[PDB]
Design a protein around this nucleic acid. Structure first.
Lengths: 94, 46, 271
RNA sequence: AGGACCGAACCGACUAAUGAAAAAUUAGCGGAUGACUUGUGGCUGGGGGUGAAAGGCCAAUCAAACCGGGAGAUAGCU
RNA sequence: GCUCGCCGGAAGACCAAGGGUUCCUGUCCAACGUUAAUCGGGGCAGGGUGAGUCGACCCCUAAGGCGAGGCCGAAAGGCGUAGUCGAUGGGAAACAGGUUAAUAUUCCUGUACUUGGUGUUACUGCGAAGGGGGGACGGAGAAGGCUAUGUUGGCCGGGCGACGGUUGUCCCGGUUUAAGCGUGUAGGCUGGUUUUCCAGGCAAAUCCGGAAAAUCAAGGCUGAGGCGUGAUGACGAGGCACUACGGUGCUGAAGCAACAAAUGCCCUGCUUCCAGGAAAAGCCUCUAAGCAUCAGGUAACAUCAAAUCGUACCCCAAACCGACACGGUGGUCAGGUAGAGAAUACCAAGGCGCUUGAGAGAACUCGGGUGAAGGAACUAGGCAAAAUGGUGCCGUAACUUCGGGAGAAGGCACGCUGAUAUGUAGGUGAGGUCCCUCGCGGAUGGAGCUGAAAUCAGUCGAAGAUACCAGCUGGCUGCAACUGUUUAUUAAAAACACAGCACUGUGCAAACACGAAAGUGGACGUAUACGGUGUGACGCCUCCCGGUGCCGGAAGGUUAAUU
C-alpha cells in the first residue's frame, strides 16, 4: 500500500525519443522519467492510479549524467531513472 | 614494462579510503589537516 | 624398511626412503582432523621470529590423544596412520564403548592389538598407567611431567625413557638427552618405545625435499655483509671472530639455560 | 618414477647488432611437473622490514625510503 | 566499388580488472590528430544501458582485520575472548529463435525452471545457540566410454563454363535446432533389510558409533553421453514483391548416414605415490527445553513474490598502467590443408594496410641475398656469420657413482606411379540370424566407412627429411657435485643455496626471536625435536690449549652497594 502523495511525487515525466515511440507503438510500453528513489512497484502503483491503466510489468534503469563543459568550466548533468512500463493488452494511453 | 601503479579500486579504498582514515588516530589528523587546508577531495573516496 | 633409490636422476641418487607397508593407505579419520594453517615462522606482530620456516605441503592436524584418560575401557587398534605433523606414526584405536582416538603408535603395536589405560591396566606395550604403578627399569614413552597434563617427553619417532628409580613421591627418569630428571610419581606414562624408529635412516636427497617439509634455505653469516650478521664482510673468505648468533651471542658451547624454577627437578644434566 | 630428456605456451635474460622505449629490438639463448609459474586478497615499516646474501629490494628514489616539521641547521668554502 | 597485400592459438571473438560516454545519430573543422582532412576516440546537440534464473547485493566461511568485557601499557595505545567483518573459495533457478542506429540468457516469440511466503484440503510429532552425516577437497599416471568439432558420402537447390576439355567418378552452396521433461546407459562406489543391547557423541536422542543375532544376494547412491519428447515449430540456400539503394515485407528445398575426434565431459571417478592434501553455511538427519490436540511439519492445489544496484563502449589496447593516438596486462573461445603439435607455412570466419606523401636510385649507415681462389691467415677471442637440423634402421669408445656417457661418433633409406592388396594389416561397425531376467540387453555376423607401415617393379629431377621448421661434432683441462638463486637498469659466476657432514645449545612456561608488557612465533612440536655456527653430493681422508674465546673448578688474593 503506497501513499497517494508519494505516488504523485514518483512520476517525473514522459520520455520522448525514437526508441520510446517504437516501444509505445509496438510493445505497448511507455517510457517514463521517474524519481531516482522510486522502486518498481511504486512506479506501477502510480501508473495505475494516475493514468488509470493496468500494468503488466515495469523494467527500470538508471541513466547516468553526461559530463559537459560550459566554456572553460566542467560540469556534470544529473543522473535520472528511466522506466519502461508495459501496459496490458488493449490498454490505450492518452 | 610493468610500471609501479597497477590500479585496483578496492585496494585503493582499503588503503587510503575515508573509513580507513577514520579508523585510526593518525588518519583522523590527516583528515583534519586536509580540511584545514581547504581540500575539495578530502579523501581518495570517489 | 629403508630403501635406497636407484640413481635414475641426480637428486634421486642419494635418496633413501623409509617405507612402512602397514600404514593405512586411505583418508584419515575425519572427525579427529582439524585445520592447521602455516605460520611462515612469523608471530602476531607479523615479524619473522624463527628463520628458515616457510611453505611446505598443506597439512591437516590429527588430534592425537596425549592425555590418555580412558581408564578401564579396553581399546583395540584399528590401523596405523601417517601423521604429517610428527616424526612418529599414529594409531587409530577403538574403545569398547564406541569411541575412537589417535595415539602414538608404539614399537610393537599393530592392528588387532589391545591396549588399556588405568592403574589396573596390564604392563604391556601401548598400555598406560601411573609411574608409581610402572616397575623400575622399564622403558616408557609419552611421559607426563605434571599429573593430568598430557605426555610431553619421549614423543619422537624412536624415543623412550628409562625409569631408573622411584624415591617416595617422585621417580627419576633417564631422558633421551641423557638428562636425569625427577618427576612426580603420579604422572602418567605409556609402556614401551615410540614406533617409527628407522625414521632417522631416511635421507632427503635433494633441496626440494627439504622445501617440501616447509624448510627455507639457510644463509651462512660469513656469507653476509657486516651490517647483516656479526660474521659478515671480509675480502674473500675471512672469519677472524668467535662464532656467534645473528644476535651476537656465542654459539659453540656457551650454555643458555636460565630456568631457576625447575633447577630442583634436574638430577643431572646431559653430557 | 623423475627438483629426468627434446620442445611451443608461460617464466627468464647468456651473446649479438641496433630512443618507438628513463633498459627496448630483432636474431639467436636457459628453464619449461617444479626449490615452477600466475590471478585475487592478506601480513611484515625505516636503524625498521625482507633478503637461496648482491648491501639486493621496500612506488623510475636506498651503506638507512618518502612527506611535513626543528629550519633561514651549519658552511674558516665557491 | 573492384583488384592487391597482412594477421588468423591473432593483428579474430567474449569477459574480468581498470577506464567512465570513448557507444549510436546529426552536425562543425579554429584547436587536438606528428601532413591534408569533407574524417575522428576532436567540438556542439540529441539518443542509447530494460533481468525472479547473468553479476553484485544476500547466506557461509579462509588468510587476515576490527573487537563488548578482559589482560597489558607514562599518555597515545598493544594483544586478544565472546563476537563481528573479510573471496580469490562453498551456497536456488533459462534455454532457443527474432529484433535496435546504438541493449539484450535483460525487449519480443515460443517453450521452461526456482524458493519463499499466504490460503487450502489431507494428515499428524514439531521444536536448537546443541548431537551426527554431508559439503570436503593433493600430485602424477592410465586408459575406456563420450561429445564439441571436422571430413566424406548421401540428399536438396543451383550450374554446364570469357581459353583446349567439362551431362559427369563434374562444379558451388546448404544439410542447423537449445534448456527443460522422460528414459537412467558406458561406467564408479558400497553388501542390504529387520531385531536386541551399549561406560561413546559436554545433556537427550528413534540419528551417528560400537557390540551381538536373524535373513536375502540384490539394495541403494552416483553417472557422461545416446534415445524420445521440446519441434505440424523455429532457422534455413537462396527465390519473389517494394525500394529514402540503408534495407523492409512475403516465401522457403533438403535438413540424413558413416568415419575421425579433443587438452572438453563421465572423472570431486579409477590406479598409484608421499611431500599425506581449507573452512563454514546452505542440504539431510537426531533429539532437548518447550508445546500439547494449537502451532509447527509434508501433501498437492490456488494465488501472490522475487526488491535494490550493474548492464552502453574499450579491454594484449588509440579508451587500462607507461607524460604521447608511445613496452606491460589475468581468464574463456581454438575451423581447414600439411604436421607429433596450441610449433611452422598457406588459408577460413573475422579483422586490418600500422595518419605524412611524391620522386630519385650518390657516399655512408641499417636489415638482407650471392660470391672466383684460399678456408681462421681475422681477432683479445672463430665475436658474427656459415654449418648441423627430421623419421626409421644399422652402429656407437674412454671413463662410470653401472643409472649413464649416448642423439656419442658414423652411416644407409626417404619423392611420384603401379602392383602385392580395383584399399592390405588393423580400427569401426549396419542389416540379417539366434538368445533373452526384455533393454540404451547379450551372442553371431560381416555390409559399408576408414586406413597406416612395408616389399617388389617403374618413373622424373641437379637435388625427394626438397619450402617454413629442424642438434654442429670430437679431444685435453681448471672451478663448482648435480636441478636451482643472484646485483629490477653495465657483473649469472668459481658467488648464494643445496642434499650430506660436524660442533654447539635447548627437558618444555625449551633454547631463541618480536614485543617497556600483555602476549605471539618456536609448536598444537618435546632431544629420531627445535635453534645457532661452520662445511658442503659421492669416494679416500681429515701435531699445537701458550695467546683470545668458551666450559668446569673454587683453596687463596683482590673486590660494589650495604654497615
Amino acid at each position: 500500500m503506497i501513499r497517494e502523495e508519494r505516488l504523485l511525487k514518483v512520476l517525473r515525466a514522459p520520455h520522448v525519443s525514437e526508441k520510446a515511440s517504437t516501444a509505445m507503438e509496438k510493445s505497448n510500453t511507455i517510457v517514463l522519467k521517474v524519481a531516482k528513489d522510486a522502486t518498481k512497484a511504486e512506479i506501477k502503483a502510480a501508473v495505475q492510479k494516475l493514468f488509470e491503466v493496468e500494468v503488466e510489468v515495469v523494467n527500470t534503469l538508471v541513466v547516468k549524467g553526461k559530463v559537459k563543459r560550459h566554456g572553460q568550466r566542467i560540469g556534470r548533468r544529473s543522473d535520472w531513472k528511466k522506466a519502461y512500463v508495459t501496459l496490458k493488452e488493449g490498454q490505450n494511453l492518452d | 614494462m610493468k610500471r609501479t601503479f597497477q590500479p585496483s579500486v578496492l585496494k585503493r579504498n582499503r588503503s587510503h579510503g575515508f573509513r580507513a582514515r577514520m579508523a585510526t588516530k593518525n588518519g583522523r589528523q590527516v583528515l583534519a589537516r586536509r580540511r584545514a587546508k581547504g581540500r575539495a577531495r578530502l579523501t581518495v573516496s570517489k | 624398511a629403508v630403501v635406497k633409490c636407484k640413481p635414475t636422476s641426480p637428486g634421486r641418487r642419494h635418496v633413501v626412503k623409509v617405507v612402512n607397508p602397514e600404514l593405512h593407505k586411505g583418508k584419515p579419520f575425519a572427525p579427529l582432523l582439524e585445520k592447521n594453517s602455516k605460520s611462515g615462522g612469523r608471530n602476531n606482530n607479523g615479524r619473522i621470529t624463527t628463520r628458515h620456516i616457510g611453505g611446505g605441503h598443506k597439512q591437516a592436524y590429527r588430534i592425537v590423544d596425549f592425555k590418555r584418560n580412558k581408564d578401564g575401557i579396553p581399546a583395540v587398534v584399528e590401523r596405523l596412520e601417517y601423521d604429517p605433523n610428527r616424526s612418529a606414526n599414529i594409531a587409530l584405536v577403538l574403545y569398547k564403548d564406541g569411541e575412537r582416538r589417535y595415539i602414538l603408535a608404539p614399537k610393537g603395536l599393530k592392528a588387532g592389538d589391545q591396549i588399556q589405560s588405568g592403574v589396573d591396566a596390564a604392563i604391556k606395550p601401548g598400555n598406560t598407567l601411573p609411574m608409581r604403578n610402572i616397575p623400575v627399569g622399564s622403558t616408557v614413552h609419552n611421559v607426563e611431567m605434571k599429573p593430568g597434563k598430557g605426555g610431553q617427553l619421549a614423543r619422537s619417532a624412536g624415543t623412550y625413557v628409562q625409569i631408573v628409580a622411584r624415591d617416595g613421591a617422585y621417580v627419576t627418569l633417564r631422558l633421551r638427552s641423557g638428562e636425569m630428571r625427577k618427576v612426580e610419581a603420579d604422572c602418567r606414562a605409556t609402556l614401551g618405545e615410540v614406533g617409527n624408529a628407522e625414521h632417522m635412516l631416511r635421507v632427503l636427497g635433494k633441496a626440494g625435499a627439504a622445501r617440501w617439509r616447509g624448510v627455507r634455505p639457510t644463509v651462512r653469516g660469513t656469507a653476509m655483509n657486516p651490517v647483516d650478521h656479526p660474521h659478515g664482510g671480509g675480502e674473500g673468505r675471512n672469519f677472524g671472530k668467535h662464532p656467534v648468533t645473528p644476535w651476537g651471542v656465542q654459539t659453540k658451547g656457551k650454555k643458555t639455560r636460565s630456568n631457576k624454577r625447575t633447577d630442583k627437578f634436574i638430577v643431572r644434566r646431559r653430557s
